[model samples]
Target: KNWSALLTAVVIILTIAGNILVIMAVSLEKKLQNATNYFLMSLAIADMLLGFLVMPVSMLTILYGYRWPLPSKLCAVWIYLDVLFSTAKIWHLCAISLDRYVAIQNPSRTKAFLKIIAVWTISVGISMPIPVFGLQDDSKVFKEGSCLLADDNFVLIGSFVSFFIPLTIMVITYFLTIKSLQKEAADLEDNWETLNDNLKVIEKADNAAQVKDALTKMRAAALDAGDILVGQIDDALKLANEGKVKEAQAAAEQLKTTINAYIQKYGQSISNEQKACKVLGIVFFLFVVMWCPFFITNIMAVICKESCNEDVIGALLNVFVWIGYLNSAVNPLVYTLFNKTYRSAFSRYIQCQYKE
Candidate 1:
């Protein structure tokens, strides 16, 4: 009990401190309190409460064992709070996975609040059985102990709905999300590449067409110059016969000038055209890098174990399962990492502890 108590205390202490700091970071820095950020902030509050409200009572229960200290009603309250928060916690995580599937550049306050409420309500509704059915400690329907999940039906229902079902959904949802993201990126990449290819084709076609048109005009001008030169030669022959050689020579010189003018005019392309396209396939690349590990680890965890979830290996379980716990910590870091407002705000508060 001492060792367990110490471990829980340490966990809670860190949770409380981090949660408080993030909360402070959000509260003081109004800029950081966007809708998406709010989700994490509220989630932090739950982690804090888990450490604060649930864990202490949970530890007390752990310490007390079957020796009942709290009243039946109080125990129900404790169980309800536990079920509510814990169930809600998974659902919120589920919401996040689903939301990521949906996409969140920057979420809105009303949107985030509604998302939390929707999950919270669903959790409360699903998790209400132990609270209601186990209200009274008895031999028939309700079990007379701190751990009231002795009933086979309740165990099946509660564990399946609250933990297993949600975890399954999240894993499946994550897979779907990854697929969707992959498809989107692939589609966008294809589009850009297609556009880029199209541009090349069109530019080449235009260039060829332009060269042909320029050559055609040059040929027509050449034909006109030839006709004029032929006429001048005939005129020179006529002029020599009539002793008017100077005029014929002038006409021949004029033909040379006309041919040179044609040379100047038709020497370049007939049409000047441009073709180009922009791409952000890198957008797809970046996301896959960021979240692929998350999806893979989660999917592998559920898939690798033959018993699926129940008889999971302890160490293996911790690594994958605690990713979400690790993720909870990352939410604030992401906000601080990406958002300017949080960084500045967190810096101010963070500095207070370290600096003064």
Candidate 2:
């Protein structure tokens, strides 16, 4: 009991302080003020709620057992807030991943402020059932000492709405993101030449591992090809200025043919945001890993309440409280460690030493 209490308190403190710094980093650092980090800031807010509203009772439940310290009304409110923040955080994860995807391909693709508004609005609408239909106004639905989602139908719907739907969105967006990264092939003509670790070009043979090297060295191919075509247009203008009318006309037509051939050989490619894609993808996978088990088990318990062992249900609930809520704990470390850009948004004093 003492050890559990100690660990819980330590985690709780870390959760609170860690998220607070994340919040500060996003809010205070002007350089960090951008669309992707706006989503990250929202994530920090959701986590701060997890630490503030959710984790202390988690500590009590950890040290003592699965028991609500308060009565029924508070339990309902707790359920309401729990659902609100959990769903909000999940939506924020989806937003972060989606925003990163857009920012990677074209930062202008998404309207950042509106997307966050939609996340919070949907989260509130889903959580409104606790106050409207379940608890706040009516206020006597749950009995004392136990706080949980007791409505089987709502539990099923809530778990699907609050957890699974967001999970799907994040998964698909991350898939597309990695797909985009792979598709960012530099023009094959340009990129392939760099691997000319050959004669003028070496033969790609099946001896040891040349085939593997060729396959992996594919992405950086397309660089500067478009500029080559644009440079031809400049040459055409120079010819016209020199009073060489036929040569200028031929150069203009040749530039057009070159562009068509270039596009045919190597399709459009993304640029400059691979790091953001990686950060969101890693953070999202962690979110799903930490939270999905609890939701899946909650769905199971809701399905088989009569056949479910009392101990099994208790264990799931405790695990849900700890594991899912602690989803709030790791984002700071993940974001800091994975994102070079965001990691730079920090204590100014510390940033100054690095600046020198």
Candidate 3:
């Protein structure tokens, strides 16, 4: 009967179901169980909890005329969980972006679970004061019999600490990832051009030693081409030095084809990594866009206090907060639309098909 309630129910259901699929995909599908995916699984758990433990209470309150229907103690706990899960989502995203940047720029490794633990730890620490302060006084959580945070100080400070700071970190790290990926792509292009130039040098060489010189450099640069390739290059060089021009030219032609295959192989990996980064880019952009209004209004309500209309702030927050919740609902959709692995897994899971 109520459209607002219906919209919320849909969001809550999708948030839970979509994130469950993400968790299952990452857990059961070995292909999806990488370090970044580990972070996504943790993020999905946080979103699922938001739908389970937080949204339903808010939904009931919204349906029942914006007043607290549960016990006073339960209100404090509900507010705590709300803040905790929301903050956890942001922290997980921030951690994921930083983790991706480090992975791309350095290619070193860190324990994925350790970083996941750290993100949860920081989120809990940020939201810890919610229960501590809310339980101390009813005024901190209830205002005019409505279940809204009354602690302006905590709201303002918590917004910055939990959302703004992590948001800034996420944005910076995400852009840095894009920059690094572009640099790597450019280097890949340069590598191809250098290989092409060397191939020409090999072909146009009048002397055997000239072809050998170019082949030596090509072998060094194609370190990714494996030992067998190195051995073949070595044999080609030996043939050139032994004055076997026909055999050496044949070897050079074969080397060109093999090296091109390896180049294409290596290039595909870079392209795949770039695709993953672009997916994260979309996720990060949507997060900032969705959550921005709520945090902005949170601060405006605090700073404008008497100057701003309370009802206006309250109404906008009521709407914007749902927009924030919708972020959790849409993230799985973004992954499904953009990522082939997630798309296939999500489709199969929805159809109750798990294998493969």
Candidate 4:
């Protein structure tokens, strides 16, 4: 038994099984039918095609010691799909992160617009240009008797469009989101402290008339709490303005704790907008961690191309480089696990599937 063949078969099987399960879960579970799920579904379709069509051909070439047995036409189609789907994966992930960010940080009105116009437009716009970029050519430098984009101007341009632009957008959106979350959190905390002060003032009132006065004062204090919260929020904003976002974030957390205490005392719920911002903060952090490795490897590959052992090094670094590709399989899980709406819809769909 050829070990390489066995290894390839296992990898392909795992990739197909994992991605297929994700697709089935999303499809059968009606809760996963939203724009976010739709995007994930598209991603899964791309990954499935990549694994079934592209990887097998590439693996055949690798097993045969990088020799091509197929026609140049077939190779061209493979190259085109490889570039198209790989680019699609990068932009799709960016779109997912953007959707999560907007849903968490902005109003519902804006969410619909972003989901429909902004996210899809950006994903398609980034992904639709690969064939035009001449990635379909079999004579390309990385051609190696198999379909792959050469390290050329077209590759750079395609990479920038599909990878860098969306990456930049994710960074900006998440940065603002985290900053906003920190500010809101700090204001919440400070409001709690103000509530404590008001309670003490109310407790110290002696006479019945003084008690009435204290009640009036407390009402006024409650109104003033908004102003105090605004002041703290302003200070948090100032830190961001001064480019000390980390410090601003710390201050914001303090405010959030203060406000939570105040809300508990005052019998009010935390604002929905603030809660959304907190979710965006978490999504952004995850996006950064998941994608940074792929981008960094891409940069290193481009910069060190001349000095590096291009074949072995490129293959090794590609493990990280393909992380973005692997992440295409992750969004369905993320949605089902983290999002209640998706989970509920998925559950309903699963039950329906059993009935059929």
- Please give the CA lDDT of all the candidate structures: 0.52, 0.66, 0.85, 0.57
- Worst ten-residue run, lDDT, model 2? 198-207
Q: List the residue pairs that clash in candidate 2.
A: 186-221, 186-222, 187-221, 187-222, 191-221, 198-202, 199-202
Best by lDDT: 3
Model 2 TM-score, all chains together? 0.73
Using all chains and alpha carbons, the TM-scores for the candidates as numbered come to 0.56, 0.73, 0.92, 0.62
Model 2 residue 139 CA deviation (Å) reads 10
Q: After superposition, how far is residue 352 of candidate 4 from its true place, in Å?
A: 9.7
Model 4 RMSD, rounded to 1 decimal = 10.8
Model 4 agreement with the true structure over 1-356: per-residue lDDT tens digits: 23455556655665575567567766565645566556666667777877788777866766666566676556556666666666666566567666665665544334543554554456556544444444454455345554555546655676676667877886776566566656656666664565456445434533334333433443444465454555565555555455554565466556556656657654333354454445534444554566567556656667777987768655654455345444444544555566676566556555654321
Candidate 1 regions with alpha-carbon error over 4 angstroms: 26-35, 62-66, 103-107, 138-148, 201-347, 353-356
Q: Summarize candidate 2's per-residue lDDT along 1-356 as a digit string, tens digits.
A: 44766767777777888788788877676667788778888878888887888778767656645566666576677778878988998888888777667765652315777888899999999888876777643323343345666667777888777778878888898898888676555434454354343212113242323322332232223234334654555555455555555554455445546655666555433433565666677788787788778777877776677897967776666666677777788888886787665567544434443341
Cα deviation at 200, candidate 3, in Å, is: 1.6
| Tens digit per residue, CA lDDT, model 3, 1-356 | 24579889999999999999999889778778689999999989999999999999889998878878988888889989989988888888899899888877563125888898899998888888878988989999999888788898889888887888988999899888888878877877776776678778888877888878887887776663335567788889898888776678778889888777877886898799888888888888888789889888988999999999999999899999999899889889988998889888998898998888
In angstroms, give how far residue 271 of model 4 lies from its true place. Answer: 12
Name the top TM-score candidate. 3
lDDT of 1 by residue, 1-356 (tens): 34545554555566577777777876666655555456656677776666677656655654664344676567666667755765776676667666765662222678888888887789879867766766664431333443434344654556566666766766675667556555544544443343334333323433334323333333343344224433434443454345444443454345456544533343221111000000111212232344345445444544454555533433343333233333333445555555566567767776684222
Span of 10 residues, lowest total lDDT, candidate 1: 270-279
Which candidate, 1 or 3, has the higher TM-score? 3
